[PDB]
Amino acid sequence: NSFSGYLKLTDNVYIKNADIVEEAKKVKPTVVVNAANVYLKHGGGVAGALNKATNNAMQVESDDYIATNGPLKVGGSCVLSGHNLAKHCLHVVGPNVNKGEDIQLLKSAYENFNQHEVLLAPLLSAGIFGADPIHSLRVCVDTVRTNVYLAVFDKNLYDKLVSSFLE
Numbered sequence: 001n002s003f004s005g006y007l008k009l010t011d012n013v014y015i016k017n018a019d020i021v022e023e024a025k026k027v028k029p030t031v032v033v034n035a036a037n038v039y040l041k042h043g044g045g046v047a048g049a050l051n052k053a054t055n056n057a058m059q060v061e062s063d064d065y066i067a068t069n070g071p072l073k074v075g076g077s078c079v080l081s082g083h084n085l086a087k088h089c090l091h092v093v094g095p096n097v098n099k100g101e102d103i104q105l106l107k108s109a110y111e112n113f114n115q116h117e118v119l120l121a122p123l124l125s126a127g128i129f130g131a132d133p134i135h136s137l138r139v140c141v142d143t144v145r146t147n148v149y150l151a152v153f154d155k156n157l158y159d160k161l162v163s164s165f166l167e
């Protein structure tokens with residue numbers, strides 16, 4: 001958990017302009033959060049990047065989990081191996097508002113982080129999931145009580161988020 005160069009927003013929420021894959025390699029976190037979908041198909045974006053960094057071992061494990069347990073629910077999660085990126089990967093499904101899912105499920109999605117003491121995570125439901133990233137950060141700060149290090153891989157969005165928080 002050797003997080004470096006983060007800006008502390010509250011006593012338990014930190015943020016950095018960084019690629020979550022590169023952070024996972026530098027930090028060696030106990031838990032890395034994946035921005036998953038309910039069938040754990042890591043086809044692109046954050047999930048595709050984390051799977052590629054494991055040389056597809058995350059996707060094979062994920063397929064075996066789904067075969068035995070069935071899909072997750074939106075707002076839900078599961079704990080699988082972190083492979084070379086962390087001790088564990090917490091796969092969390094935030095709502096995809098571009099696909100009609102309820103933005104209220106973003107609170108349930110962040111609540112899964114409270115089962116782990118320290119996590120490296122992306123900003124849930126942002127990017128092509130369509131939620132307003134300023135709102136996602138607000139839900140994170142209000143919901144997460146354990147220690148969360150957010151990696152946001154876009155300096156333009158990072159600056160807007162820090163300027164929204166410090167208003």
Ligand SMILES: CNCc1cc(-c2cc3c(N[C@H](c4ccc5c(c4)S(=O)(=O)CCC5)C(C)C)ncnc3[nH]2)co1
Pocket residue numbers: 018019020021035044045046047049122123124125126127128129151152153154157
């Ligand atoms: C350029 N080579 C591919 C690639 C991409 C990455 C890569 C992207 C990325 C990231 N993006 C942010 C984000 C946050 C959440 C969601 C998405 C996107 S999404 O994938 O569109 C849908 C699920 C939710 C974005 C708002 C700046 N944040 C952190 N670390 C990241 N790493 C490495 O390699």
